Amino acid sequence: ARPCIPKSFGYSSVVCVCNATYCDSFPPTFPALGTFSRYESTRSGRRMELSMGPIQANHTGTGLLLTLQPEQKFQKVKGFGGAMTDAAALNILALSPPAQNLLLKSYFSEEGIGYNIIRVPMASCDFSIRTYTYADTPDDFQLHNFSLPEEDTKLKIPLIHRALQLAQRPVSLLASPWTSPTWLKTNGAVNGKGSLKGQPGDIYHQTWARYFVKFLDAYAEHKLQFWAVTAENEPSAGLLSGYPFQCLGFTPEHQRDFIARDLGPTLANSTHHNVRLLMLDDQRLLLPHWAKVVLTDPEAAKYVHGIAVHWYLDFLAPAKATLGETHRLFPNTMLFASEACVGSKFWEQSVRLGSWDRGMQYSHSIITNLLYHVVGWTDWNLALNPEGGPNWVRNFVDSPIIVDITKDTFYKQPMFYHLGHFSKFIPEGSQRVGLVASQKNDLDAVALMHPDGSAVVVVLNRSSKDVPLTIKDPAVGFLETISPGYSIHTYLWRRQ
Ligand SMILES: *[C@@H]1O[C@H](CO)[C@@H](O[C@@H]2O[C@H](CO)[C@@H](O[C@@H]3O[C@H](CO)[C@@H](O)[C@H](O)[C@@H]3O)[C@H](O)[C@H]2NC(C)=O)[C@H](O)[C@H]1NC(C)=O
Ligand SMILES: *[C@@H]1O[C@H](CO)[C@@H](O)[C@H](O)[C@H]1NC(C)=O
Ligand SMILES: [Mg+2]
Ligand SMILES: [Mg+2]
Ligand SMILES: [Mg+2]
Ligand SMILES: [Mg+2]
Ligand SMILES: [Mg+2]
Ligand SMILES: [Mg+2]
Ligand SMILES: [Mg+2]
Ligand SMILES: [Mg+2]
């Protein structure tokens, strides 16, 4: 294992500096029964530092106790990852090959944080430098002129293969479109207010559904298979006049009927029938309404595997009214967080190198999502430049890895480590279990059990105050620990 090379840029914490010959690295340590592992990251600069401690048979005192309830079972976890946008691919490929491989290993290798999801845009988005679709030849309803351009064949696809080949965990791919070809749209433009022409069940909608199959066919020719697709990225965006970049507007009723008549049946009657379909792929305030509109129509519901949710400017929001209510109404339709990013005010710089606050936003969001039944959490761009780009409409945002081309260097932000406290230690098939606090407290925490029956607990302290605490597992005993102010911990232990 190789330690963080820390660097401050004046924010509250440090980045870890990587280059062609060096990057910080680690696989999770399950010590002997009766011992626990602790991984600690701190604002002061500790980065996922491993320590161990004893598990006692007994505990006495008045301090905070967190008690696992391993017989209280909740959702199974699909996983964690990020988005291979054109911008992410361009930034990674701007490094020398050895630096590229250390960046990819940081995310995708067991030496890194064990990502197992990659979100793949279907053609261009704001994090593109060229506006294109896969079928720009006008009025090509047959999709004879459907093809993948070099953004896919020379940048994204080869990087996806490289990422998958570094992983031991199976990696799941998720596809989402931003716009259709403009000749399928009411406004004839990639951006602005515009929807598919006509109505679900017609030639425009059947062509758009077929475009999904042609996309999956084309990636399958490149030996890539998808776990899932979403029905549209941010369908509410295309309802807005002046929307600045690629979009395709659907009301929830339009999405319902498109799924029922066109996309569901077209996918089901294809070689890609095992690919899951996720609805919504948009902000939380649209729930539970969107779920009610789509999932109460049995001819739409039969095709919808899950509900994809985005996080933006609401990482510290309460989720009971949106995620909680949606789970209560539709508990057998999984919730999955398909996109999250930190945005700045329109006049502010998008990237804050070394912001601990942005790290805490990521981990607080992941904990909140897990406590409201969400099965996975997906970051946005895997890497950006120090401006938060490139981006053809200057809609810059932050990313967990920032590439500086001019020094063949990349910077791992606090967000990287906050996500890794979950991704590295919560394999696919892990299950959230109960965790109860003895007294009111300022901590954020979640407990899960691995498929093999091991325990994992994440404890985030967004306060400035150190909090001594005890964790009880009724089968092994008590972990006496401390949660320092501005820390995040992941605890691991064997239960037998
Ligand atoms: C990439 O990052 C690594 C880690 O921060 C940098 O590693 C450093 O590499 C230099 C190589 O010149 C090492 O310097 C050595 O200094 C001694 C003492 O003067 C000298 O006798 C040696 O010949 C050599 O120059 C340095 O110790 C090493 N540090 C670590 C922690 O491994 C590397 O420089 C970075 N690459 C670039 C291009 O900045
Ligand atoms: C579209 O595909 C057809 C059939 O292969 C081909 O004849 C035509 O040249 C293509 N059109 C364009 C504009 O590429
Ligand atoms: Mg600290
Ligand atoms: Mg308790
Ligand atoms: Mg897959
Ligand atoms: Mg408009
Ligand atoms: Mg495919
Ligand atoms: Mg409007
Ligand atoms: Mg978005
Ligand atoms: Mg981003």
Residue numbers in the entry: 1 to 26, 28 to 497
Give the authors' words:
The lysosomal glycoside hydrolase β-glucocerebrosidase (GBA; sometimes called GBA1 or GCase) catalyses the hydrolysis of glycosphingolipids. Mechanistically, GBA is a retaining β-glucosidase which hydrolyses its substrates with net retention of β-anomeric stereochemistry. Retention of anomeric configuration is achieved through the Koshland double-displacement mechanism using two key carboxylate-containing residues; in the case of human GBA, Glu340 serves as the catalytic nucleophile and Glu235 acts as the general acid/base. Inherited deficiencies in GBA activity cause an accumulation of GlcCer within lysosomes, subsequently leading to the most common lysosomal storage disorder, Gaucher disease. Here, the production of active crystallizable GBA in insect cells using a baculovirus expression system is reported, providing a nonclinical source of recombinant GBA with comparable activity and biophysical properties to ERT preparations.
Consequently, our GBA was studied by X-ray crystallography to generate a 0.98 Å resolution unliganded structure in a novel crystal form. During initial screening, crystals were also found under condition A5 [0.2 M magnesium formate, 20%(w/v) PEG 3350] of the JCSG-plus screen. Optimized crystals suitable for structural analysis were obtained using 0.2 M magnesium formate, 19%(v/v) PEG 3350. Previously, GBA has been crystallized in space groups C2221 and P21; however, this unliganded structure crystallized in space group P1. Overall, the three-domain tertiary structure is highly similar to that of the BTP complex and Cerezyme, with Cα r.m.s.d.s of 0.49 Å (Q score of 0.94) and 0.60 Å (Q score of 0.94), respectively. Despite the sub-Ångström resolution, residues 26–31 and 314–319 were challenging to model, reflecting the flexibility and disorder of these loops, which has also been observed in previous GBA structures. Importantly, the active site of this unliganded structure compares well with the active sites of Cerezyme and the BTP complex. The sub-Ångström resolution of this unliganded structure permits the first ever atomic resolution analysis of GBA, uncovering finer details in its structure. In fact, many alternative side-chain conformations could be modelled throughout the structure, providing more detail on side-chain mobility and interactions. Multiple alternative residue conformations were observed throughout the structure, including two conformations of the catalytic acid/base residue.
